[PDB]
């Protein structure tokens, strides 16, 4: 792929997402979704191999089905109201269709399998862009249409996402599948808080995006896609492993790190609405995510795995490409708990 073509495809993905986030018309929002998917497929297929082709095929099928359901919901809403503006939807059936379509686009359970499948299939840069941006857009649509969300359906899908992400991440050994299940669990948390505070949804989105960017860029720096490949990083550049360890501790929600702020604020907000069982279950279930984060931390930094002999040549050579904003993402993902009241600025 030509660099000009790649940058124009990235620009087109961002253009689709921005069209979704600036449009006041359902047709224009659907157009933005379609443009985003159309420019996103080749990004997945950039490094051509059967795994990448299969991941792109599964992603295309899922997103096409979601777009069909979304346009059906738009049409049904138009039939009963004659309105194209994105507001509270006027038909419960259309609202259910839209909720299911946006949940499928996000990867909320039980629409999650494509997330680990595609994330394993595609490279690290593709997975980073996929997770971050393709969560960025449908959450914007949901925040706009939150006041008509069915709380029962939204919270059911959110709790399912949390449980399934925890269990899948428990089982996986592949780093990309681990990141995908982490994404599923975090999306569950965000959509669980969504029907109450879109501000808390946005706060969790920002913190999750920062932590995910830091983790993916650390993986790209170490060029490790498996647990054992990451187990050799301590013998080449031990600083990256320590930074990954503190980022993993933050992503598990351990105080006083940045990952505790979204969980804390969401639990507080849901408690304000007389919800106790759901916050307690969500808090207890995240211990699975913390467990497999800790298991990954044991293999990479807290213990020394055996290495090989060509690692001496690797010692002799130095990393060339410089990650952009990696130190900033590492600092923002661990040390911004004292800056919590800025969510009012986020309001």
């Amino acid at each position: 792929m030509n660099p000009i073509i790649y940058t124009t495809l990235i620009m087109t993905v961002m253009s689709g997402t921005m069209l979704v986030m600036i449009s006041s018309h359902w047709l224009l929002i659907w157009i933005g979704f379609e443009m985003n998917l159309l420019a996103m497929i080749p990004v997945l297929m950039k490094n051509f191999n059967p795994r990448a082709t299969e991941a792109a095929t599964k992603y295309f099928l899922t997103q096409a089905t979601a777009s069909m359901m979304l346009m059906m919901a738009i049409i049904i809403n138009l039939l009963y109201s004659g309105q194209w503006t994105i507001t509270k939807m006027f038909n419960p059936v259309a609202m259910t269709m839209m909720t299911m379509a946006l949940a499928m686009k996000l990867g909320l359970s039980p629409f999650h399998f494509w997330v680990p499948e595609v994330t394993q299939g595609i490279s690290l840069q593709a997975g980073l862009l996929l997770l971050t941006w393709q969560k960025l857009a449908p959450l914007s649509v949901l925040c706009q249409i939150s006041q008509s969300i069915n709380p029962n359906l939204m919270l059911t899908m959110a709790m399912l996402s949390i449980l399934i992400g925890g269990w899948g991440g428990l089982n996986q050994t592949q780093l990309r599948k681990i990141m995908a299940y982490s994404s599923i669990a975090h999306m569950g948390w965000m959509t669980a808080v969504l029907p109450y505070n879109t501000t808390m949804t946005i706060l969790n989105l920002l913190i999750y995006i920062t932590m995910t960017l830091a983790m993916f860029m650390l993986l790209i720096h170490s060029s490790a896609t498996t647990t054992l490949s990451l187990s050799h990083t301590w013998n080449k550049m031990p600083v990256i492993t320590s930074l990954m360890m503190v980022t993993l501790l933050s992503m598990g929600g351990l105080p006083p790190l940045s990952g505790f702020m979204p969980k804390w604020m969401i639990i507080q907000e849901m408690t304000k609405n007389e919800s106790i069982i759901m916050p307690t279950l969500m808090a207890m279930t995240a211990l699975l995510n913390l467990y497999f984060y800790m298991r990954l931390a044991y293999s990479s930094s807290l213990t020394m795995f055996p290495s090989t002999n060509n690692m001496k040549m690797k010692w002799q050579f130095e990393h060339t490409k410089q990650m952009k904003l990696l130190p900033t993402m590492i600092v923002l993902s661990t040390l911004v708990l004292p800056m919590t009241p800025a969510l009012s600025s986020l309001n």
Partner: protein, 105 residues
């Protein structure tokens, strides 16, 4: 979520197409232009909650104009009663309803 670039910059990208009571080519009116105008002017500036609570009469008239459910119920009831009456020979349609008249120009 919603970055109102159109409102900030004074642009009009899809607001022209959002509603059916806006500027249409050749001043072609919508089917329910009056009802949509009434509902919009009722609900303007009071928010979604108050609009749903208080402009419910205008919204119900708008939806009735859009879908014609109550009108179809009335027409079906009249048709069923007339068919039952003519089944037993208790009703005789007028010649102008039977097609034996000269309508107005």
């Amino acid at each position: 979520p919603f970055f109102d670039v159109q409102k900030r910059l004074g642009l009009d990208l899809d607001r022209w197409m959002t509603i059916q009571s806006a500027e249409q080519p050749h001043k072609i009116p919508g089917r329910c232009h009056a009802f949509e105008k009434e509902w919009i002017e009722c609900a303007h500036g009071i928010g979604g909650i108050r609009a749903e609570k208080e402009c419910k009469i205008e919204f119900d008239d708008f939806v009735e104009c859009l879908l014609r459910q109550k009108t179809m119920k009335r027409l079906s009831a009249i048709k069923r009663q007339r068919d039952k009456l003519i089944k037993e020979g208790k009703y005789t349609p007028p010649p102008h309803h039977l097609g034996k008249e000269d309508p107005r120009p």
